[PDB]
Amino acid sequence: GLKAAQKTLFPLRSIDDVVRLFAAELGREEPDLVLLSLVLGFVEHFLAVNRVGLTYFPVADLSIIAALYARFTAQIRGAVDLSLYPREGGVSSRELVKKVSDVIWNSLSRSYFKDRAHIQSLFSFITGTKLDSSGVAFAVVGACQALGLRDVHLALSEDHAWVVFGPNGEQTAEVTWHGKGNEDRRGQTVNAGVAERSWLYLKGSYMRCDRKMEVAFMVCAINPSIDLHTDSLELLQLQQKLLWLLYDLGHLERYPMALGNLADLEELEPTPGRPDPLTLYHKGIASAKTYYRDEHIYPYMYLAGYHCRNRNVREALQAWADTATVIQDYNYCREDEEIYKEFFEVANDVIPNLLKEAASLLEAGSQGSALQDPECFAHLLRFYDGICKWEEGSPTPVLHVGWATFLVQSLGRFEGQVRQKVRIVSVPPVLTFQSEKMKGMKELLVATKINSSAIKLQLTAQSQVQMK
């Protein structure tokens, strides 16, 4: 049950009342994940899913929240008999974690669309019997906290979630699915994935949450979307205020993606007296460097995206080059397709569109253009170098001829006299290439008219040209 002290702020009548509840729970020994997720899902439902009758804020009455809480706790406590899984040393067993996962998973509707909005919270789980992938992992952690299992924590990569538990928190267990059309591995460790150096498991440099970071996760998980064209202003404000609460308490210290998510919100609607979005993106990068060996991709892609939206071509290119410098030390594995898609869209859609506008502006007499800056050309080259190096040693190739056309076009946006100014230096602007593909392309990069076919051959390592 809920404790008397957890009840005293009800009813929640406003955004600020919800923030007060989070503040109170974050001040407790162990914030109550079940309570907090039910509250966020309740308000999200009445602000984004069904706004009929809304006049200001969907009042969250204690009776309503408490009844939701009771259905959750009844469902878990009834289904997981702890006497069957004795807790050796105040820590949980793999069998117990797998049982909790099975209870959540088996509760879900047989058939539904898993990419739907607003199926992330325990409100969704109770009222709709639907959860998204990471929502299952979160629910397992909330269930384990409800059961008294203090050792079970959420583990997060940039594209997946699982749990850590056991002696010293050193065990890992899959508790949910990943992607579409991959085989369930619930109950197994993440060691194979770590060992293969996939992006999905971040070479072991994934997040191991404490309770407060699990609160940060559910706050990041708020979805203000009403439809394709419309966001709930109330939910954006809530999410923003809650992320600032977390930030001020120190709970975003080790959470790069939350910092990027906050920065994005600040760009949309700045809060007076707070750091600028750029400051926040750089704090996210610093976090990744400090805590995660600089092995995360998204801190740089958040930064690049801000510069791209602001049509700052030079800084966007630098940040994408930095992105590629991270990815180069990974192997491209099966289940890494979301990061492949991201890189593909940057290379083959976003950069081309940025450079096309830059070319039109240059024709109109822009000064200090990225297209006349050899450092910008160098960034472009370093972006491609990291992608080519990523591919090296991977079980799965990255590049194909569909990339080559866009590379030739992008290179050609820079005049030969700009491109000539980059000095490509070997080990043992100045640029060093890590990838063998770019080293062999060096020779092609300064011609007034780039040799399109030779580029193509070098990028795809195509052996032959057409017979006839």
Footprint of ligand 0RT on this chain (CB under 6 A)?
Answer: 134, 156, 159-161, 217, 220, 257-258, 261, 298, 301-302, 305
- The nearest distance, CB 211 to ligand 0RT, in angstroms, is 16
Residue 456: CB atoms within 10 Å: 17
Which residue bears the tokens 């400051």?
A: 279
Distance between CA atoms of residues 41 and 125, nearest Å: 10
- The nearest distance, CB 280 to ligand 0RT, in angstroms, is 13
By beta-carbon proximity to ligand 0RT, the closer residue of 142 and 305 is 305
Query: Measured in whole angstroms, how far is the alpha carbon of residue 302 from the centre of its chain?
Result: 10
Distance between CA atoms of residues 336 and 317, nearest Å: 23
In which order are the strands placed within the sheet that holds 161-165? 171-173, 161-165, 153-156, 207-208
- The nearest distance, CB 439 to ligand 0RT, in angstroms, is 30
Distance between CA atoms of residues 87 and 144, nearest Å: 12
Residue 426: CB atoms within 10 Å: 8
Residue 269: CB atoms within 10 Å: 10
Distance between CA atoms of residues 179 and 199, nearest Å: 14
By beta-carbon proximity to ligand 0RT, the closer residue of 217 and 377 is 217
- The nearest distance, CB 34 to ligand 0RT, in angstroms, is 18
Bridge-based pairing state of the strands 171-173 and 207-208: unpaired
Which residue bears the tokens 């064209």?
A: 229
Paired residues of 173 in beta bridges: 163
Query: Contact at 8 Å (CB) between 265 and 243?
Result: yes
